[PDB]
Symmetry: D3
Subunit: 175 residues, 6 copies
């Protein structure tokens, strides 16, 4: 492989540009387009940068200044690229939830925040009854998954986590 | 009370403010409209509020005015009530749907959460995510139980908690 | 069938769910409302569904009930149909507008894309962007043509494709 | 120019802060305000940092530790600043589009994603007929640009790209 | 003019386009609907536009058609006017609310800004933020005063400016 | 404290991941969860990383390679973490506003952009009268704050900034 220093520099500027705005569902494909543009029709060069930037792996010896630049690109871009790829694949999946209990009047309510893999969040208020209905709805859904052969195998994989839920619930009912 | 074609002018104004999505300012924009149509007079405004919020006519009206009044009530009472609801509790959960899908040996759920204000959020969960969400929400019920107000709330929904019992039983047993 | 003031209670409930923007949960929220007004009975629910979805009364009603029924049909049949449309195809394109502007020696277009669900997106393009978008979309038609199902779809719209012909002709010739 | 090391440090913290959240339409102006605040009414200091951070150019010799810090600031912030400036100028222009063909039933449809320079994206579904109508609409718009003297010159600039579109289309029609 | 059940077909179509939130394309979508119902004829379209935009019937109609026409006017004239307003000035401020709260020795305000298009934005300010915003806006009035057009605008609102005077007086004096 | 180099590496990857998407209201809590996971139930390790990453302070001597990694983590993540914490606390507060005056026809209007601490922005158009009404509304709000003991103390703190507003306004009225 014969690369000029200029390629690493141009590639860095282009990657800095695409990652300057929020990662979205087009970002992984936009990154691939940047690599292909840089490779200029040379599959071996494209693959070199994909291995480097997607896998953090250097598939040939580089001269010291280029090796340093590759390490810098890996450090700066590997995770954001993997997150772009993740969003492309499963950006709408739940990633995190927070809840803050507020006690007002007679009533205990929760300010819940739902965050997805793609970073979008949603605020949702629930009182204690809403919370119970939400739990029942989600349990009803696992019970339907359990009838299906795939769902059944998925549930058997976390059988310990399920038995625990029942524990926590038995703990709530006694009190 | 003494009133002019106030009903038609009230109508045109209510049609305008309700032609766009109802928001958190809409109930107050409505009050401002009523105030303006009453020329600021509190007795007349109150007559309109009773009519429009509670559907109650506090005064006999000539046939033509009475016809317009019943029309305003049919057309606006519920949207006004929803605007007040949103002002008060717009961020609370209102509805949830889930569609079960099977992708790559995984049972997954496309959930949609809708609030009182009509905003919705799409959230994907797999079986393990669903279990974690349930654990999270259960923990909130436990948190409420430790707070004197929340504990009273829980005591009011015994039939709700028993329902969670039977679902938890069915799931654990079926595995 | 035996029915109570069910029409008025149905009305108030439909007015409430349609007072906020229609979303992807709205058709299902409607079904739940009908179910609840029918006290769960499938024959009564079906009577309401025929009435409200298809505008068909499957039963003679006293004058007062019949009046309320025609009113529910006029007020809700189309919003119900749109809610079902959105549930099914809410993300599909519905309308596009373009306004041509001239800025700094450039012809530019302010495009607005609107979906079946009513969400809109503003997108600016210059002449070269517009050309690239067209090239992209053309490539999709070529992609569909390589798929046996897509190829059948294309064969159904011969008059559409000829229209593209005449536009392409006019443009190339005029340059 | 007489700068204390403290200025580079304070400037870095302030820039890190403003770039911690998504770039928006106010971000370039917010950056200018940070520079002016740091310059403290000294135009020569403001200009030094603007040349450095907007143009990547150092307009006077710096001592080695400050030169290193300037290079670090350039590497970290030059591209995001240029993107902020770009968004300020043309954030609503199209930047990228992806499409995924889905074959279901009899029908080939495309899940399109529209991304703007500002990073916002929009999902749009199209079937084969929608795609054709979109193409015709966009061609109609170029034809109107062609009547206008500016638009005509813009089109002559990409005359080769246009002739190519016609090619791709002639290729689609034969098949 | 010669017309068919055009009123009912017009009705169903208007009900459909107004069933979703009004957007920036809605007025144009309406015009397209009218065009299509008129079978493209400009005289018939104009009859519908007068009826639907201005509430004016430019033609005597049989009792049944006349009834349908008055119904279309009552149901759609205002939403059409709002759609045109939005097309023209959707981003302009329409309403603002503020609720004053006290948190941690601070007086704070929960402000909500609503535009002509119905979109809203929540914005918190403390006392100093509120002062800065006011200073900003005052500076804009000063900017307009330096522009010959803006200076004319200011001269038209003398009673508005005096109101700012009395408020400014009350505040400074009370401190 | 006995940490393996692997901990710094794992921690960096996890932080890079969470900061790859827009900071939101859950991000500070997500960061705490990452630290606790890394500490693996060891409060002293959690506190070491919290002091390091929240306060930029190293609470024990590290070997040179680990000290270098800690400095790198501080440089990369301290500000974004502080911004996450800020958003958690006051993300909805105003952060910045820009205005651009547009002169069209007889009329001077302003394209205002409102940016919050959380990075969300809102575009709002105002003409000269809207601007005056907005000022009056905000002054009315400060006048109400002045009646309240807390608000009064807040206002006394910026008494100089208030007197200045009055100045700028007196300057506008003379002209």
């Amino acid at each position: 492989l014969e690369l000029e220093d200029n390629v690493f520099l141009l590639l860095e500027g282009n990657l800095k540009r695409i990652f300057a705005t929020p990662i979205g569902y087009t970002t992984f494909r936009e990154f691939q387009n940047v690599v292909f543009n840089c490779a200029n029709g040379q599959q071996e060069i494209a693959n070199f940068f994909f291995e480097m930037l997607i896998n953090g792996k250097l598939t040939q010896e580089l001269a010291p200044q280029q090796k340093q630049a590759a390490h810098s690109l890996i450090a700066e871009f590997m995770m954001p690229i993997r997150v772009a790829k993740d969003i492309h694949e499963r950006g709408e999946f739940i990633n995190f939830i927070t809840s803050d209990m507020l006690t007002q009047q007679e009533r205990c309510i929760f300010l819940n925040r739902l965050a997805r893999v793609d970073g979008q969040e949603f605020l949702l208020m629930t009182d204690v009854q809403n919370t119970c209905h939400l739990i029942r709805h989600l349990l009803a859904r696992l019970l339907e998954a359990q009838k299906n052969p795939v769902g059944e195998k998925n549930l058997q994989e976390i059988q310990e986590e399920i038995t625990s839920l029942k524990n926590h619930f038995d703990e709530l009912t006694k009190a």
